[PDB]
Every structure is written in C-alpha cells, then in structure tokens.
Design a protein around this ligand. Structure first.
Ligand SMILES: *[C@@H]1O[C@H](CO)[C@@H](O[C@@H]2O[C@H](CO)[C@@H](O[C@@H]3O[C@H](CO[C@H]4O[C@H](CO[C@H]5O[C@H](CO)[C@@H](O)[C@H](O)[C@@H]5O)[C@@H](O)[C@H](O)[C@@H]4O)[C@@H](O)[C@H](O)[C@H]3NC(C)=O)[C@H](O)[C@H]2NC(C)=O)[C@H](O)[C@H]1NC(C)=O
Ligand SMILES: CCCCCCCC/C=C\CCCCCCCC(=O)O[C@@H](COC(=O)CCCCCCCCCCCCCCC)COP(=O)([O-])OCC[N+](C)(C)C
Ligand SMILES: CCCCCCCC/C=C\CCCCCCCC(=O)O[C@@H](COC(=O)CCCCCCCCCCCCCCC)COP(=O)([O-])OCC[N+](C)(C)C
Ligand SMILES: CCCCCCCC/C=C\CCCCCCCC(=O)O[C@@H](COC(=O)CCCCCCCCCCCCCCC)COP(=O)([O-])OCC[N+](C)(C)C
Ligand SMILES: CCCCCCCC/C=C\CCCCCCCC(=O)O[C@@H](COC(=O)CCCCCCCCCCCCCCC)COP(=O)([O-])OCC[N+](C)(C)C
Ligand SMILES: *[C@@H]1O[C@H](CO)[C@@H](O[C@@H]2O[C@H](CO)[C@@H](O[C@@H]3O[C@H](CO)[C@@H](O)[C@H](O)[C@@H]3O)[C@H](O)[C@H]2NC(C)=O)[C@H](O)[C@H]1NC(C)=O
Ligand SMILES: *[C@@H]1O[C@H](CO)[C@@H](O[C@@H]2O[C@H](CO)[C@@H](O[C@@H]3O[C@H](CO)[C@@H](O)[C@H](O)[C@@H]3O)[C@H](O)[C@H]2NC(C)=O)[C@H](O)[C@H]1NC(C)=O
Ligand SMILES: *[C@@H]1O[C@H](CO)[C@@H](O)[C@H](O)[C@H]1NC(C)=O
Lengths: 48, 109, 141, 187, 49, 179, 52, 109
C-alpha cells in the first residue's frame, strides 16, 4: 500500500511534467513566424 | 505487407491471458519492430512535405493502432489485478460484464 | 611481354607497386572488442537459475546485439566472392554458437518444468543425470 | 562585377515605367512551388562596403534576398508524432502492479530504446553546425531525461513495494507520513 | 546438471575459437620481400649498381 | 560494318577479345559467354549495328553469408519456440524477438536489392516467407498459452477438443501422459 | 481443490498436445519451403547457346 | 549526453530487488540501447586509425562499465536463488556479510 500511494502522486507529477514540456517546446516552434517586413526597421513591403 | 503483418499482430495481444506476464512484452516488442521498420520506410519512401502519401497515412494508422492497444492493455491489466479489499465492485459493471455479455456472445467457450 | 610483338603497343610497360598494410585500430575499438565482450555473455546465461525467467531473454538479446554488429559490418566491404573476411567468419561462428546456446537453454527449461502428471522419471535418466555426471563435473554435494 | 570598379561601371536595379523593381520577379501563373519551402519575401537592394574605396571591385553590389519558411509536414508525420506518442507511454507505468509480472521496467526501458532509435533517425537529418541546438534535438534530450527519471522512479517503487520484515523495518513515522493524511490530500 | 555440462562444453569452444580466429589474423604480415622469386629488396637505401 | 580479323589476319573474330597480360577478373561476376553478331531491322533498311554480348553469372557468397545463414538460424529459433513449456514465460520473448531480428535483416537488405517492379527477387520472397512463418509461430504460441491458462471458473471443456486432443492425437504424436 | 486441479490439468495437457503437433507441422513446413526455394535458385544457370 | 545517461542507468540496476524478475531485463536493455547508439557514433565520429579519440575512449569506458554491471548482476542473482540443500554458507561469508558491513553501513534503514 505504501508503494501504491507513491505511484499515484508520482503519476500526477510525471503527467504534468511531460505535458508541459511537450507543449512549451512545440508551441515555441509553432510561434516562430517570419517577420512582417523584409527589413525590420523599414516601412516598405517591397512587393509589385 | 510488413505493416499489414504488424497490424494483424497488434490485434492478437487481446487473446493473451493476464496470468502470463507477457502482454507488455508482446505489445511493446511489436511497437519496437514497427519503430525499426520506420527506418526502412524513411529510407525507401520519398521525403516530401507537399502532401501526406497514402502509404504514410497507413503507417500512421498502424502506429496509432499499436499505441491504443498498449493503453487499453494497461487498463485490462489494472482491472485484472484489482484488490477486493479496497475496490468493492460496483453494480453496473457487475450487471453488464457478468449477466448480459457472457450470454449475448455465442462463438465462445 | 614476349608473346606479343615489338611492332604493337602492348609489348612494354612500367609498373609501380604499393604494398600497404592496414592499421587496425578503429575496428579493434568499435567492432571487435564490443562484439567479443557482448558475445561472452551468452555463456554466462548458463549460470542463471531457472527460477528467474530470464535465461532465454539474456541469450536472445545477445543475438540481437550480434545482429546489429552484422548490420554494421555488412556496410564496409565489397560484395566479392573470392573469400569470406575474417570478420564475417567470426560473425557466423559466434552467431551459430549463440543460437546453439538458445536451443540448449530451451532444452534445460523443458527438462526443468516436468511433473509426474506429464512425464516419467526413467531410472536410466536418473542414472546419468543424478549421480555420475555431477561427480564428474565436481558439483556441490 | 569581377573586373570593373565603381569608377568604371555603375550597377543599378531595373526601373520599369518609372518605378524601380526592388524585388525578385516570379511568374504567378507558371511557378511551381518547391515542396518543402514557401517564399515569404523577395526584396532587392544596392549595397556598399564602406571599408573600401571606389577603386576596388567589391565596393558596390546588388543583393537579392529570399526569406523562405519551411513546410514541416514530413517531420510531423514521420518523426514528431511517432516520437511524442511513443514517449507518452512512460506515464502508463504507474498503473502497472509492483510485483513480478507487472513489467514496469520492461515498458519504461523499452520506451527508452525506441527513443534511442529515434536518435539515429534524427542524427541523419539535423544540420551539423555548432552555434545553437535544434528544437527537435532539444525535445529528444528532454524526453530521454524524463524517461530516465521514470525508470528511476519505477526502480524505487519496486524496491519499496517488495520490502519484507526480514530485510527492512516499517516505522510509525513512515506509516503516519504515507497512510494518515497524504492519501486524503491525494486521491 | 544438463546446464553445468552445457557450460563446461560451450565456454571453452567459444574462448578458444575467438583467440584462434584473431591471433591468426594478427600474424598476417606482408612477406617482407616484394617479389617471391627475387632476393632484391627494391629499397632506396641499397641500390644494385 | 564487318567483324575484326585475328592477329594473323585470315579469319574473323566473332567474340570479345581478352588479353591475359591485361585483364582483371571482377570477383563478383564470371563471364560465361561473349559473342558478337551483326543485327539488322526489317522495317529499317538503313540500320546496321555490331553488338557485343556478355553473359555473366553472379557469385552470391556475400549474400549467403549476410542473409541466408542468419535466416536459417531464425527459422531454427521459430521452430524451437514450440518446444518450450508454458510455465517458463519466455515464449513471447522468443517469438517476438525473432520477429525483431527478421526486421533487422530486412533493414540490412534494404540498400542492396534492385528497385524494379516487374518481379520480386527470390531473396525477398525467402525473407517474407520466414517473416510470415515467425508471425504464425507468434499466433499459435498465443493460442497455446490461452489454452494453458484456462480453468473451470472461466471455461467448460467441449467434446470435440477433448476427443481430438486427449484421444486421437497423443497416440500418433507419441506423447501419452502417465495413466 | 483436488477436483479443480484435475480439471485444470486436463486443459494443460490439451495445451501440451497442441504444442507438440504445432512443432511437427512447423518443422515440416519450414523444411519443405526452404528446400523448394533453394532448389529453384540452384537450377538457374545460363544456357549453352548464347542464341547470339 | 546519451553516454552520460546510459552510465547513470548502468548504475541504477543495483537498487532493483531480485524478487522482481527484471534485473536482467533492465541491464541487458541498457546494453541494447548502447549497442543501437553505436550506430550513431559510427555515423558521426571520424573513422580514422591515427589514434583513439577522447570521445571513443569514453564510449568504450561506458561499454565495459555496462558489461561489468551485467556480469556482477548474474553473480548476485545466482547468490540469491542458492539452495541450502546443496550449498552451506561459509564462516567467512556469514562473518563479513552479516555481522560487519550491516553495522558499518550508515546511510541505510
Ligand atoms: C536578412 O538578412 C539581411 C542581411 O543579409 C538583412 O539586411 C540588413 O537589414 C538591416 C535592417 O533592415 C540593415 O540595417 C540598416 O542598414 C542601413 C544602411 O547601413 C549601412 O550604411 C550605414 C551608413 O553609412 C554612412 O555612415 C557610415 C558611418 O558614418 C559611413 O562609413 C558611410 O560611408 C556612410 O556615410 C552604415 O553605418 C552601416 O554600417 C551600413 O554600411 C541603415 O541606414 C539602417 O539604419 C539600418 N537599420 C535598419 C533598421 O534599417 C542592414 O543594412 C541590412 N544588410 C544588408 C546587407 O542589406 C535583412 O534585414 C534580413 N531580413 C530578415 C532577418 O528578415
Ligand atoms: C478474430 C476472431 C475472434 C473470435 O472469434 O474469437 C474466438 C477465436 O479467437 C481466436 O482464435 C484468436 C485469433 C487466432 C486465430 C488463429 C487462426 C488464424 C490465424 C475466441 O475463441 P473462444 O471464445 O475462446 O473459443 C471459441 C470456441 N469455438 C470456436 C468452439 C466457438
Ligand atoms: C533434443 C534432445 C531431446 C531430449 C529428450 C526428450 O525429452 O525429447 C522429447 C521429444 O524430443 C523432440 O521432439 C526433439 C525436439 C528438440 C528441439 C528442437 C528445436 C530446434 C529445431 C531445429 C530444427 C521426447 O519426448 P518424450 O516425452 O520422452 O516421449 C514420450 C515417449 N513415450 C510415449 C514412450 C513415453
Ligand atoms: C504456411 C503458410 C505459407 C506461407 C506462404 C508465403 O508466405 O509465401 C511467400 C513466399 O513463399 C514462397 O514463394 C515459397 C513457396 C513455399 C510454399 C508455401 C508452403 C505451402 C505448404 C508447403 C507444404 C509469399 O511471398 P510474397 O511476399 O507474397 O511474394 C510475392 C508474390 N507475388 C509476386 C505473387 C506477389
Ligand atoms: C537513485 C539511487 C537509488 C536510491 O535512491 O537509493 C539509494 C540512495 O542512497 C545513496 O546511496 C545515494 C548516493 C549514491 C551512492 C553514493 C555516491 C557517492 C558517495 C540507496 O538508498 P538506501 O540508503 O540504500 O535506502 C534505504 C531505504 N530508504 C530509502 C528508506 C532510506
Ligand atoms: C604484387 O603483385 C604483383 C603483380 O601485380 C606480383 O608480381 C607477380 O607475381 C606473379 C605471381 O607470383 C608472378 O608470376 C610468377 O612468375 C614466375 C616466373 O615466370 C612463375 O614461375 C610463377 O608460376 C608465376 O607465374 C610474376 O612474375 C610477378 N611479376 C609481375 C611483374 O607480375 C607480386 O609478387 C605481388 N607482391 C606481393 C607481395 O604479393
Ligand atoms: C541476350 O539478349 C540478346 C538481345 O536481347 C538476345 O539476342 C536476340 O535473341 C533472339 C532470340 O534468340 C533473336 O531472335 C531470333 O533471331 C533469329 C536470327 O536468325 C531468328 O531466326 C529467330 O526467329 C528470332 O527472331 C534475336 O535476333 C537476338 N538478337 C537481338 C539483337 O535481339 C539473346 O538471345 C540473349 N541471350 C540469352 C542467353 O538470353
Ligand atoms: C608485326 O610483326 C608481326 C611479326 O613479324 C607481323 O606478322 C605483322 O604483320 C606486323 N605488323 C605490321 C603492321 O607490320
């Protein structure tokens, strides 16, 4: 019974750890988007 | 053909009794074989991102099939080694999985 | 070349020879030592008690490791057929001895799990495997 | 120019109808997209290296830029999704029995082995520079460290669950620490 | 008993076969003379004439 | 176009010429025939070529040592799995590890087999044969374990199973249990 | 308990008999298939007339 | 980093009790992972024979570390399933491993 209480608690810690790590890493990837302007400080778009 | 074979084996785990301690061995080794065959797929198939091929949809169906089998196998093992002292079996599980199903099935012993 | 004639262009040549020996160290470090030390373990499989459930797993995993070394070796030599490389000869010899260890462990298991309800203990098999062999192999009591 | 300097030739961009063409021209009708890369921006400008004079040939230069985004679809299907789904299996070890036959170590160490095969698969694809660590390799290091922590947790729970009075003494401090209020505060 | 016997039989064959196979390869040296039927050494340190 | 004449020219040479002073044997290929014949085209009166042919036999020692011996050893294991007792618990381990090994051999051969779709090479047919055999060994081992772990609380023995496996088969298979 | 034991041993005996049967069947099938493939491969030689 | 991970795992096996049947599973699976990592080492490291690199010295230290752990695990398992019917505990073993180290051991319970 002592080991079953440890597992339930350690379950609830491991689930959070894995989920949060996965989501943080891959949402950083998802949010890495191209800038809006070709040259940052320039207000031109350089398109025909 | 290897993917077909792996899916057919992926279903077999549910005929293996829990008394033997080998359900996880079977499931996870099927997954290991599929992971090693993924190196062969990645070597033979063209690597493009224009669209998902049909062969790739099939490989990912097989993957999700194996992983779902593993999860439900862990739930079966947990339901099998359930201590009577604590868990007092409820009436709805007792009625469903003891009175109706055993009788509805016929091709069985 | 005296079989040819001096009025052709196949009668003369100047040849330069390089006799070079390979320095074996990369292979000695990354292939031979790992493979030999992993292979020895399949014989240690004969010391594990039968009441452990890992006699077969040990030898079969050693055979999977050997299959990975076989995959690694298959990629370094040409596919010529004048001889079998010393490394391939060792590989086939060691993989066939590991297969023999797996079969022998399966036979030890088969004999371990016999019961009065399925098999008979012959007086012959009790003569060989219970008093004479143990004394010859010098086994505890 | 490989031969002439700014005192000899004057490099400029083209001007159609009075307005300069400060971009790479791409035929909208006939252009076939790459397969892995999408073109976001295509500007062009005349640059000068001010460390040099107008007597050098490398003082003036026309630059065309191509800012391209990647299509991460082959990677999501063949690597990302299989590896995420396979690494999510290490949380199923907490519902397996802590006795001979539960196979808690079997499952966790086999997931580690699968991650070790995904290391070779990624090893064959990542750039080989050394200025930053890629996101895929960062995630692999993360999941393999989480798998190692869960292997250690499985080993410790098996050690605790298989203890006997002949080996260890169970103390009232422990029982009161794990069987008084924690199960209440937990499950 | 079958297991002790299988040990005292398999282990020697494995060790001796490994030693033999690799010592045989360790003793494979070039013939020390470039051409079999020729005493010359074709060395820069000892020209013939 | 004609054929070339021999050294002392009187007669034509209708084969590829090989000079022993300068010829390196391949090591993987034996030259069985090397003829030479002029070819025409009935639809094209202006066509004429001189073709040289090389009938060559492959020497398969490399593929024998890297594919066939491991597969024979795997098939030995796949037959061994039925000699194991169910009480050991190393049965699924044996079967499914054999499957993993055949997958490794498939990987090994993935880079050496022609990528044409007019036929299947005999070596790939042999590998698929061994793979399906290992799969069926796995299936029947699962069936055997299922039968072995049955009990009266869960199953009642029918009559056809009892007849076939307690009266008809043992006398043939020489496995009659002690009375 | 003795009665339950006897009825479980009948099931275990059925399993052992099925196992021996499968053993023989698999040995025979493996041998036959391997030999037929190897003979098919051994009888593939080029002819004597190059027909050219 | 993978070699560091594998070394730490190679050390973990000695806290796992033999009552569970998974010490050899754990040890040999660590060894299998290291052997499959050898494929990445051979793909990435330079295959020259001028000298043994430092990374290669480390790979080989890890290999012999794992293999020594496996051998000593087999000796521990054999010492655990030892039948009194055939082996009598000697006086030196009963003195050193029952009446000395237990007491010397501080960090314990
Ligand atoms: C993709 O990569 C490209 C690079 O390959 C990025 O392009 C860069 O973008 C930056 C930001 O848009 C540019 O910075 C801007 O540069 C211009 C020009 O700077 C040059 O001239 C300066 C002035 O020269 C005078 O003064 C000097 C010192 O007194 C004298 O020595 C000289 O003779 C003149 O009298 C000089 O100081 C400077 O070092 C350069 O030579 C500036 O006017 C802007 O203020 C800069 N900032 C901004 C916000 O525009 C950068 O020039 C540009 N490089 C190239 C090669 O075009 C591009 O942005 C990237 N796109 C992305 C990441 O999306
Ligand atoms: C899918 C079949 C599912 C099925 O019918 O289950 C049954 C077969 O189930 C099996 O036999 C499991 C699958 C193994 C098939 C082996 C042969 C084909 C390969 C489950 O079998 P059962 O209910 O345990 O017994 C049926 C007995 N009866 C055939 C006399 C009725
Ligand atoms: C081998 C050694 C044989 C050991 C003896 C033994 O028990 O053999 C058993 C079978 O023996 C076999 O059927 C041989 C099987 C060997 C395994 C082959 C696997 C590798 C496949 C490679 C390709 C003998 O059975 P038994 O129970 O002694 O027979 C009962 C006889 N009675 C009815 C008269 C009582
Ligand atoms: C028992 C199960 C039999 C398995 C048969 C099998 O898998 O055959 C495999 C090959 O195998 C051969 O071609 C070898 C021939 C042996 C005959 C099979 C044994 C029959 C009974 C003996 C007493 C099938 O191979 P495949 O990958 O389907 O090959 C492609 C064939 N195609 C070109 C027609 C598509
Ligand atoms: C992870 C390793 C396993 C583990 O946590 O237990 C080890 C950590 O105890 C140590 O021994 C920790 C230090 C590692 C070894 C020594 C490092 C160098 C000094 C051993 O712990 P223990 O003291 O043998 O455990 C007794 C029981 N208790 C956990 C209730 C105290
Ligand atoms: C390295 O290779 C060269 C050839 O590329 C070897 O030299 C040649 O070796 C052959 C075989 O030993 C010699 O042929 C022999 O000639 C004698 C005399 O006619 C004959 O009696 C033998 O039966 C045989 O045919 C050949 O003469 C010799 N020389 C040349 C120029 O080809 C050389 O030996 C090799 N070296 C090593 C260390 O292997
Ligand atoms: C190797 O390949 C070559 C070319 O594909 C084969 O040569 C061709 O063989 C066919 C069949 O023998 C020839 O057709 C026959 O030609 C004779 C000519 O007199 C005619 O009488 C027959 O009725 C028939 O048409 C063909 O001419 C010949 N040449 C070419 C260029 O196609 C060759 O046979 C192959 N060898 C082997 C061993 O398969
Ligand atoms: C070369 O010499 C041979 C031998 O004397 C002779 O038969 C042949 O005709 C000569 N070739 C030429 C081109 O003179």
């Amino acid at each position: 019974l002592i080991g079953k209480v440890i597992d339930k608690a350690c379950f609830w810690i491991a689930l959070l750890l894995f989920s949060i790590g996965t989501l943080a890493i891959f949402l950083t990837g998802h949010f890495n988007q191209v800038p809006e302007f070709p040259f940052p400080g320039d207000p031109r778009k350089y398109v025909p | 053909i290897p993917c077909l074979l792996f899916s057919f084996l992926t279903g077999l785990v549910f005929y293996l009794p829990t008394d033997s301690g080998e359900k996880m061995t079977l499931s996870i080794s099927v997954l290991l074989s599929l992971t090693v065959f993924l190196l062969v797929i990645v070597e033979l198939i063209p690597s493009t991102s224009s669209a998902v091929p049909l062969i790739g949809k099939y490989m990912l169906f097989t993957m999700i099939f194996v992983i779902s089998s593993i999860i439900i196998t862990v739930v079966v093992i947990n339901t099998h080694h359930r201590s009577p002292s604590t868990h007092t079996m409820p009436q709805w599980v007792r009625k469903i999985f003891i009175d109706t199903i055993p009788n509805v099935m016929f091709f069985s012993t | 070349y005296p079989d040819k004639f001096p009025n052709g262009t196949n009668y003369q040549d100047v040849t330069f020879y390089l006799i070079i020996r390979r320095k074996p160290l990369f292979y000695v470090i990354n292939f031979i030592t790992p493979c030999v030390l992993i292979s020895f373990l399949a014989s240690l499989a004969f010391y594990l008690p039968a009441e452990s459930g890992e006699k077969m797993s040990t030898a079969i995993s050693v055979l999977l490791a050997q299959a990975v070394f076989l995959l690694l070796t298959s990629q370094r030599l040409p596919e010529t057929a004048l001889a079998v490389p010393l490394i391939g000869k060792y590989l086939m010899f060691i993989m066939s001895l590991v297969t023999g260890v797996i079969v022998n462990c399966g036979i030890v298991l088969n004999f371990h799990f016999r019961t009065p309800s399925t098999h008979v203990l012959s007086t012959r098999v009790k003569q060989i495997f219970l008093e004479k062999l143990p004394r010859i192999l010098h086994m505890s009591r | 120019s490989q031969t002439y300097n700014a005192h000899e030739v004057n490099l400029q961009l083209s001007a159609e109808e009075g307005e300069a063409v400060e971009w790479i021209h791409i035929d909208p009708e006939d252009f076939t997209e790459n397969g892995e890369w999408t073109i976001r921006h295509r500007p062009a400008k005349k640059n000068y290296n001010w460390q040099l004079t107008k007597d050098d040939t490398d003082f003036q230069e026309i630059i065309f830029f191509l800012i391209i985004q990647r299509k991460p679809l082959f990677y999501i299907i063949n690597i990302i999704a299989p590896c995420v789904l396979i690494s999510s299996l290490v949380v199923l070890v907490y519902f397996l029995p802590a006795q001979a036959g539960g196979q808690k170590c079997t499952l966790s160490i086999s997931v580690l082995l699968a991650q070790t095969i995904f290391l070779f698969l990624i090893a064959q694809k990542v750039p080989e520079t050394s200025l930053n660590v890629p996101l895929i390799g960062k995630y692999l290091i993360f999941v393999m460290f989480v798998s190692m922590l869960i292997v250690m947790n499985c080993v410790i729970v098996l050690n605790v669950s298989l203890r006997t009075p002949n080996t260890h003494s169970l103390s009232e401090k422990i029982k009161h620490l794990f069987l008084g209020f924690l199960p209440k505060y937990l499950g | 008993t079958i297991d002790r016997l299988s040990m005292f039989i398999i282990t020697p064959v494995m060790v001796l076969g490994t030693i033999f196979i690799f010592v045989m390869g360790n003793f494979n040296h070039p013939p020390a003379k470039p051409f079999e039927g020729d005493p010359f050494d074709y060395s820069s340190d000892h020209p013939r004439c | 176009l004609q054929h070339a004449l021999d050294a002392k020219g009187e007669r034509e040479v209708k084969e590829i010429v090989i000079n022993k002073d300068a010829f390196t044997e391949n090591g993987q290929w034996s030259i069985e025939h090397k003829p030479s014949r002029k070819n025409w085209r009935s639809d094209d009166p202006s066509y004429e070529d001189v073709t040289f042919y090389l009938i060559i036999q492959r020497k398969p020692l490399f593929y024998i040592v890297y594919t066939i011996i491991p597969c024979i050893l795997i098939s030995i294991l796949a037959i061994l799995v039925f000699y194991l007792p169910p009480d050991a618990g190393e049965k699924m381990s044996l079967s499914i590890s054999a499957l993993l090994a055949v997958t490794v051999f498939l990987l090994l051969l993935a880079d050496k087999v022609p990528e044409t779709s007019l036929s299947v090479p005999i070596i790939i047919r042999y590998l698929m044969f061994i793979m399906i055999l290992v799969a069926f060994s796995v299936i029947l081992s699962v069936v055997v374990l299922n039968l072995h772990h049955r009990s009266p609380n869960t199953h009642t023995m029918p009559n056809w199973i009892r007849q076939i496996f307690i009266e008809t088969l043992p006398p043939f298979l020489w496995i009659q249990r002690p009375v | 308990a003795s009665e339950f034991d006897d009825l479980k041993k009948d099931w275990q005996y059925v399993a052992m008999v099925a196992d021996r049967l499968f053993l023989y069947v698999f040995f025979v099938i493996c041998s036959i298939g391997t030999f037929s493939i190897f003979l098919d491969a051994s009888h593939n030689v080029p002819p004597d007339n190059p027909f050219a």
